[PDB]
Write a protein that binds this ligand. Structure first.
Ligand code: CA
Ligand code: CA
Ligand code: CA
Ligand code: CA
Ligand code: CA
Ligand code: CA
Ligand code: CA
Ligand code: CA
Ligand code: CA
Lengths: 193, 53, 21, 193, 193, 53, 53, 36, 21
């Protein structure tokens, strides 16, 4: 009952991230405006979720099989091409890029990137490294590559347009993102808060 | 040439040492949470100045 | 008797002029 | 560490090509207007991509399994039949054809051709030759059949029409093309630029 | 053709690094003037090379067996010793040291170190660590132990002299450095620039 | 190159350029010798020296 | 009690190191006997600061 | 001797000539820690 | 497979200074 050993408690679950919002015409006036979501995939990034709760009770973690899922909340009569990739290096930031197609290319080139219209549902996988490294579960601190195993970026490629070849400007809400994960936590503890 | 060996070997060695003393803080100084932290000593090998490890 | 503590090796190499073929 | 041998470094990836644009009514006034995309499939045809970058670091290449993917950015309320074939001979040019249905036929006849509506997603495979020939990775030079292993042609078969049997004329943007490839590069080098 | 696999692309090559410049008498007045080179040995430390160009298209890397190679561009009548080593710790900095013998001794203390005359050629190996660790490719960021696997210091032990007792004073070029490397990159991507 | 003309095709099974020096070790200059298997890669378009090297 | 071993053992270990550079004094400075002494380095184990011995 | 070159001429630069290594073997006896 | 068509052979020879006796 009082064992001191440390084992990997791999456990599954699903959690709700946030609601997506395409940017529209007026607000989309540059390349950084096309970045709708910059959402770390660290277990402790979503407060009221189950993943972050559990994370708070372990020191280290490692995504065994994660996947960000998109669920549209819009009809088929609208169209907007998105791109979703999870960068395994959080310091890689596309906001510093000025060329838009260069940003789309560095997105598409990620081995786990997916493109789709904001009226469709698709799964954005996470790709796991090969060196067996474990990440930390607490809030982000002096460095970010210890905690965050990945960073989900959502892109608005084309402009939001209605039935015809006509654009929209009201910047409506498209859908919500969900996380379907299975993670392995290592060291039991309680992290400060 | 005078080349120096390119062999990376794990030199493992064992022994005991002495970290520090513990000072229980007492009723006067014990008026906070931080007051109840008596020792914060890293376990890095290079955190024990006097020792030979 | 920790072996190979700080070993160093020396090896010469003559440098003649006009190596001919 | 200083081996001189030459091996095939087969590696996978995906990359973003460009955004498609159906031509509409006013601009579609002949058979060459129905050719929306003339995009070589040489590894070094897409500058900011990963495929062209990698290509620049090898002399020869060979598509082992490539596929051009279409991702719509429009609703279901619009309709336009497209055709997508990848010609393994770049010198074959349909622009010289005047008859439209003849162009559609020589497209459909390609063994890897696919047809679909611009509101749907579909995969356009590349078909690889049988003689083991390798192609070159640099910019196109005196001849084109050494570099380009294929050429992606996109067609506008019918006219862009709205809900009813009514045509559109604003020449709206339909979607974007992506490349899902696995290629084998042969000779390590750096090509000039 | 859309495989979502992460596989290490172990691939070999060789690259031209820099023309080294032994310091002479005028410029060499103190100890840190004897550090001819301070060159990280991260894949992406050499802009125009091939290794860095490839690195740009991956997240990570790990030198499996790298080696720096010095090729002299001088005759044998000139004489000056050089000590070269690669500290696996990117942060350990000998520039702070004032005594020259102390610096040469902490150099010779490193395991993969070598000594040689700038008139002959040798090879400076990189001794890879044991904890299967991977390193990132992008431009060095907040910390360096995440990115750099080593740092190549090239040292001037003696004074530059020629046929006669004349002590050269012009800080002339002695040779050229070449990297004969073998590394495996893991996660396809594009690093910004 | 005279026998070449008597056939219509060829393929080097094993080729290796060999440098025969004529200078002593009292002169120095670095050289790079590579055989490019694509005759259409011309470095003369390269302006940068280190890029060429 | 926590007694520390009373065993005196001869720990012998071997390796090379680096003493210092030699500076021949030349005609200008070589005008005396002391001028001809280029190195005065003790061989005590604790006379080599940088080394690990 | 005087420092001299190819010719029978002496040099006056007070130059450096090389380095010295110590290939040693030592036996230490009594564990302790010396102060400093 | 005409053997020994245009064979060439290389053989070096060091040229040191002051060969002493
Ligand atoms: Ca990235
Ligand atoms: Ca590790
Ligand atoms: Ca923690
Ligand atoms: Ca054809
Ligand atoms: Ca063939
Ligand atoms: Ca080429
Ligand atoms: Ca070090
Ligand atoms: Ca990166
Ligand atoms: Ca070439």
């Amino acid at each position: 009952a009082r064992s001191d050993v440390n084992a990997i408690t791999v456990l599954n679950g699903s959690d709700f991230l946030t609601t997506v919002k395409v940017r529209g015409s007026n607000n989309l006036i540059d390349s950084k405006s096309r970045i709708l979501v910059k959402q770390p995939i660290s277990a402790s990034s979503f407060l009221g979720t189950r993943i972050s709760g559990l994370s708070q009770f372990w020191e280290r973690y490692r995504w065994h099989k994660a996947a960000v899922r998109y669920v549209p909340a819009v009809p088929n009569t609208l169209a907007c091409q998105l791109i979703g990739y999870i960068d395994t290096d959080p310091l890689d930031d596309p906001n510093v890029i000025l060329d838009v197609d260069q940003l789309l290319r560095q997105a598409t080139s990620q081995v786990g990137a997916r493109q789709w219209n904001f009226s469709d549902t698709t799964t954005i996988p996470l790709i796991v490294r090969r060196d067996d490294q474990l990440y930390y579960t607490g809030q982000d601190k002096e460095n970010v590559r210890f905690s965050q195993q990945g960073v989900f970026y959502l892109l608005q490629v084309t402009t939001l347009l209605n039935i015809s070849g006509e654009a929209i400007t009201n910047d409506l809400i498209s859908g919500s993102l969900y996380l379907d994960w299975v993670c392995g936590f290592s060291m039991p503890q309680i992290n400060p808060s | 040439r005078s080349a120096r060996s390119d062999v990376n070997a794990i030199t493992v060695l064992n022994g005991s040492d002495f970290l520090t003393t513990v000072k229980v803080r007492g009723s006067n100084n014990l008026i906070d949470s931080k007051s109840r932290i008596l020792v914060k000593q890293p376990i890095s090998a290079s955190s024990f100045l006097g020792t030979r490890i | 008797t920790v072996p190979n503590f700080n070993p160093i090796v020396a090896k010469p190499t003559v440098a003649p002029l006009q190596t001919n073929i």
